[PDB]
Design a binder for these strands. Structure first.
Ligand SMILES: [Mg+2]
Ligand SMILES: [Mg+2]
Length: 109
RNA sequence: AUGGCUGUCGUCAGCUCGUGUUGUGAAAUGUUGGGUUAAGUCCCGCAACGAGCGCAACCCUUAUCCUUUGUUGCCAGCGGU
């Protein structure tokens, strides 16, 4: 069942009321998530996620921070899988048709 | 009442657009920020991504050197004084 050795929870106060259902925490000012509920979402997650990787995988691994950027430009970068490892230029989906040519310049370059 | 022309802030760094986003809306963002430039100059940052007019460059001149050209210009090495 549990696979996350030391991923436990995180984040002291700064919590978000909406995150009670998945919190069982306490230990020292910072709450532990609900290890026993995290996983039941690897079900459904990787499921409906796989259920469209076969329907034809088009993903986009959004993840940024000089502390994980290329730990995402990884076997994630590789497969049926796109990504963004730095500042997410805003409107890049909603303005893909202005940005599409921001690509044409990348390649032409 | 005007065309054309001209002073002027000021060769100051400014003025805008599309698309995206935001607000009920006038509008906003972009162009609020951190540096730096002569500069909206540039670099980082950034719900914006991109662009046009201005900044800059392309023009004249000046400072070095090469090619060509030697009269009306030049005289280094020559012969004539
Ligand atoms: Mg400019
Ligand atoms: Mg100019």
């Amino acid at each position: 069942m549990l696979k996350a050795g030391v991923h436990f929870g995180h984040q002291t106060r700064y919590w978000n009321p909406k995150m009670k259902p998945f919190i069982f925490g306490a230990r020292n000012k910072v709450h532990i998530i609900n290890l026993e509920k995290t996983v039941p979402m690897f079900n459904e997650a990787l499921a409906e996620l796989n259920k469209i990787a076969s329907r034809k995988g088009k993903i986009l691994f959004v993840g940024t921070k000089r502390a994980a950027s290329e730990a995402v430009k990884d076997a994630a970068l590789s497969c049926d899988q796109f990504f963004v490892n730095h500042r997410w230029l805003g409107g890049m989906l909603t303005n893909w048709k202005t940005v599409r040519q921001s690509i044409k310049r990348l390649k032409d370059l």
